[PDB]
Symmetry: D2
Subunit: 384 residues, 4 copies
């Protein structure tokens, strides 16, 4: 499985060290003027300066590249860095971008405030309906950007169907697969051109690092992305790369538990009288379950449910003993959040409506704690 | 008036669990007491933390240190100098705006302004900013920003920061200054009229050659908020461990700069009088054009500068036979570094910009560290005197 | 009751500035509010910190996690397993005391007990602790301690911890158990009657091969205070960064141990039926001597064990033609390690005491990781055909 | 001869993958090429690594830096000063041996020597080592070691290291010196005849208040090997991250020490002439007994020293009303620290030893940092002149 691959990354040992060393350095020495000059022209093997390339970071990049099935991967200081670099490395004044209508808050901010200032046209549309994508299409359409399942509502898009449109019509497909991890969703295997993650979430999974990663189908696209990163400057620190690579060693095993724990918690919620509705892609009752079972080999453990009022969401969120009230997701312990007033508080009213985000919704990110302990925590909070 | 050495060693803030050194907050998220307290923090109400991309205690401590020396309204830390530069320009410039920038700049700044900005509909002109009249002649109705690096990397070309600020202030343009080469001990652009002062922290501020990072400081609370708003979406963050290391390096910044300044002037004078050396571009030498501007507008000099050999082969022979100096890119480290701009830091600069910058194969750039200055001069002398 | 997985993920204690992950207190010293407040802390009242050698918040968080799983009065972290062992024995033993220790121990423990303790006037007997009557027969009027490893490094020899604890309780001696090889998920010596339980945290507890450290946990508040008092003067400290890494590694200990156990078991059964293998020393095999004791005293098994090849040449051929397993010392890492005890971990052990622990040039020690077992079996299988 | 500043910035050793900063080997174990190569390293021949308890590259780099300044045959790093002290004594002393140690020592060293060593059959006398005749009078046929701290913590009592060395050399005893208070910039006990020189690295060497560590250096390959043999079984290891930080702190050791030495002397003179101050114990003052010995045997002074107020109440009022100085134990940090030995560092010292040390409630110990010395003096002055 994917576990052996992750624990046995390709490459040589450094001074026979079993654990890969942390290259906490800015610069590298040259043997001669020519050797230094050659590296600047991309000939020969070696390093120049950590913003161009750091061995500890490259090891992390290789690990993600191996499970994505990519030509190459680039690490960043945050998911937002991956997202900016995977879009603005390509899009320019006069170009048009189609993006999902329901996206992580700060992605809405990027697509909605910054891109138009740089002369990029952006439409947000319901990407669960492939014909809706075809109708928004323009002659200057250069990219489609998807998040599936979406944050926070878990709305599922047909990545593979959109990928066909993109191939035929000459556009890049970018997919944020943060919510599912590369164990369960491999967008490049579905026709996508770029797959990206907030490493801050599942990939690292220990709640102690912010980082991003972007993987490209072609060698030319990852070189462009890295060229942008050189100038935009969102870098993963060597220490964070050591921590991310370390976290990734247990990724396959953690995902297995996240997925099963998640399925079980959602079912407890779906059949509980105080719960109106549960948005989890693995449920038969959820719209897009068929597409998601087809296009993914498993599910993340972050999902959303509806209470009967705002008072009751507040009641539940503030009387839990095990779950922690905090933003973020995909950590080893359980997190709980209120999107309307937190993660998606800054999202414009009209995008708020079309997304379906209301004060009645509560988002949970189920950890790898014993499931029954998680359920008993939710139980006492709901029933008391 | 308390000395800068004392200020850096005693930054404002409450201790955390009485810890003498400020802890490393290696965390992504923060817990809320209640939905309301968390809701409130999201709308800027109250004091506290949400998520490290928005604000991390260890990073904020480093920001406060830099803010206190720049004399700013606030500072923002980044994953690299280039993150600070992108976020200090593109947070304000939009399609249809015009930027005037110096014609001699760090190579990747040239890349950013010359490849990326035009793609975003931003008009850019690279101008000799050592002549205020050339800046005025380049001005247009839509000019919104002037960006300077002075002394410039790598030729040390000096721009009249005060003189250019007057023009920005009269015409509604922001003045942004990259002061990396001098450090905030010696060059404080906010006191000269700049709106934004920024640094690659990777050089002098950290000083120890073991971190890549950036910082930008704004005169106005609104401009720093805009910068951090851009940083939130562009995602160039300083990691907590890197902030801890940068704050630690900065504790010795004033005494390191004092030694760098003195060492670099002595090495530049030795080189200036050596038979093998054609000329020396250090802004503290009386022979240097713009020495008079540099001495009025700065309070000292960094120790990174450039000199001319008689040939490319003489430069290669020198660079490769040093035992104290290290052949490598970067600068501002405690130990002495040396490099060849034409084929290294500036090799990717388009040909017309590189000849406008005056960069040729005979030039060598040296970044003098805090080693004993006589050991540095002896290392250079032996190499210059080779069979 | 709350499951161990949940307990490790939700340790007791206040958050620091609302930080979700516990901060790394990379500091030597702490500030006082007042002379009295500083003087009061030095007298042990009430709450706070002075200096990291005395107590560091990051390190104490890790200590609390181990203490919670051991069921102890308290825990102390060290710079290495050898620091935990040294501090758990010499904190109590003095000139004229006598120590009974298992005859099969980690090589450096042998070095401690055999070279250093006798120089400090402490008498030491290495005896076969798998037979409780031999423990009784070695007993002396000055016996103050029994030290056990079970299963032993590297042969996996099992001792009757429960039976020996009764004798220790009867005769007024402390029982100290190194449970490194099994982890506190599966072996809990303090439940068995031991007074002190210790681990090289370098192995499973951290489990990522990137930290050296030790921990010792005591039944009584007085004993853990004595251990810490010794640590204050001896100076084997866990660094704040290493404590951050050990706490973090420990968050997945329960699920890692589960895979290590199942993985190890299957590899061991593969080897036991392979015609190039004379015997497998895995305590979870029905064949192995003292399996009966190990099944009763432990709730699982570690993934490190030993097995015999036909010759030294064959052992050499195995270890040098593997593609997935790594030739290296240590154990309990996420990936598979392989080692040759006679010329490595136990090379320094005196021939005399080496003879009677039954370690020969034909023995090979394997530490099974959390890789897919099928891949580990294939690696072994391919190499057993050259 | 190359300056110590240059030596510390250019340590011998190969670069690792051309990295300018030495990497952090956050690893427990190392891979072997073959059964033979692994077996050989345990023997041990020739070059390479096994397991970080036996040797770690990052830690070994820090060890070489110390070894080069001490002029030793080798150095060993530890998890704490106490770790270095335990391993520099108990690696050699066994049951039946006799140790002579100073009567004024760091409190936890008194604890080690008076509680733990006797439990191991080692005979210990604490002696006034400021008088070589008292040392000779305490000598017995089984004396194997003399252990000194000079200037002593906290009273700065000076011992004649050179005089005592002559006696150790003639009689077959090892001389062990704890030079923490002075740093290896100013005191090199191996040049004065000591067999072992050690430090709490937690103080000046690291200098930044953010690590606990120890180091010990021996004049002979055999002695450093025995120390490392002891270390491997006692298990007091320096962590890879802590070694990276100590090596980084030590890059500025010579310049920090120069500023500490001058600041401390100026603060001691200010205090000495102040009406509130009864006495000042700084070995650089001509009024101090043993000033003549310190001057001859050291090439400078650390900046930690003690002074006498008129009362406990006056000491407390001083300590609690400082804005620059920080109230906390420890010393040798870049910022100034202040402490009350009687109730803090030396509170657990048996009262027997407390009075031969001369430690009273009127004494305050100050560790003067590298802040501007006028800011430090103004902070003391304002607190001394309080209503
Ligand atoms: C301030 S709110 C906490 C952050 C949350 N998510 C982030 C996120 C990013 C961006 O990733 P960073 O830049 O690493 O945070 C990208 N893509 C997706 C699907 C995401 O969910 C959150 O709690 O929903
Ligand atoms: C590959 S070459 C090494 C880098 C060099 N300089 C960097 C630099 C930056 C950018 O700062 P980071 O992003 O922190 O590197 C910004 N501003 C200025 C005046 C700079 O000199 C160099 O060796 O000249
Ligand atoms: C160079 S040999 C590698 C080390 C091995 N183990 C060590 C060990 C320790 C000591 O713990 P540290 O001090 O953390 O190593 C204590 N107790 C037990 C049961 C052990 O196995 C080894 O591979 O057998
Ligand atoms: C709990 S009190 C704070 C510690 C202080 N000093 C320490 C010290 C050590 C021991 O070094 P570590 O083990 O690194 O602390 C050794 N040798 C000497 C001359 C020392 O001064 C103190 O504030 O006086």
């Amino acid at each position: 499985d994917i576990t052996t691959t992750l624990l046995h990354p390709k490459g040589d040992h450094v001074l026979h060290s079993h654990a890969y060393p942390i290259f906490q350095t800015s610069t590298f020495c040259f043997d001669s003027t020519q050797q230094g000059a050659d590296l600047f022209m991309g000939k020969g093997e070696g390093h120049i300066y950590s913003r161009l390339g750091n061995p500890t970071v490259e090891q992390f990049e290789e690990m993600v590249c191996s499970i994505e099935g990519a030509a190459g991967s680039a690490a960043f200081g945050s998911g937002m860095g991956a997202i900016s670099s995977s879009t603005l490395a390509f899009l320019q004044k006069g170009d048009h971008l189609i993006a999902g209508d329901t996206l992580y808050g700060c992605t809405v901010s990027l697509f909605t405030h910054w891109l138009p200032r740089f002369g990029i046209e952006v439409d947000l549309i319901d990407t669960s309906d492939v014909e809706k994508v075809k109708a928004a299409w323009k002659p200057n359409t250069k990219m489609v950007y998807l998040e599936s399942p979406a944050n926070p509502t878990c709305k599922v898009s047909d990545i593979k169907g959109i990928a066909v449109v993109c191939h035929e019509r000459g556009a890049r497909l970018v997919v944020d697969a943060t919510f599912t991890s590369p164990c369960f969703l491999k967008p490049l295997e579905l026709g996508a051109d770029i797959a990206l993650h907030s490493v801050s979430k599942y990939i690292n999974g220990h709640g102690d690092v912010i980082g991003g990663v972007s993987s490209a189908k072609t060698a030319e696209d990852i070189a462009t992305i890295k060229f942008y990163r050189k100038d935009a400057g969102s870098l993963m620190a060597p220490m964070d790369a050591f921590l991310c690579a370390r976290g990734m060693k247990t990724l396959p095993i953690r995902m297995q538990i996240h997925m099963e724990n998640g399925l079980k918690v959602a079912k407890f919620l779906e059949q509980h009288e105080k719960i109106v509705k549960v948005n989890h892609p693995g449920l038969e009752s959820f719209p897009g379950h068929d597409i998601a079972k087809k296009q993914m080999t498993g599910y993340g453990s972050t999902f959303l449910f509806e209470m009967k009022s705002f008072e009751a969401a507040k009641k539940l969120m503030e009387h839990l003993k095990v779950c922690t009230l905090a933003v973020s997701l995909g950590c080893v312990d359980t997190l709980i959040e209120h999107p309307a007033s937190m993660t998606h508080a800054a999202v414009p009213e009209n995008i708020m409506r079309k997304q379906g985000i209301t004060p009645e919704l509560v988002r949970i990110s189920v950890g790898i704690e014993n499931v029954d302990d998680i359920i008993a925590d939710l139980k006492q909070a709901l029933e008391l």
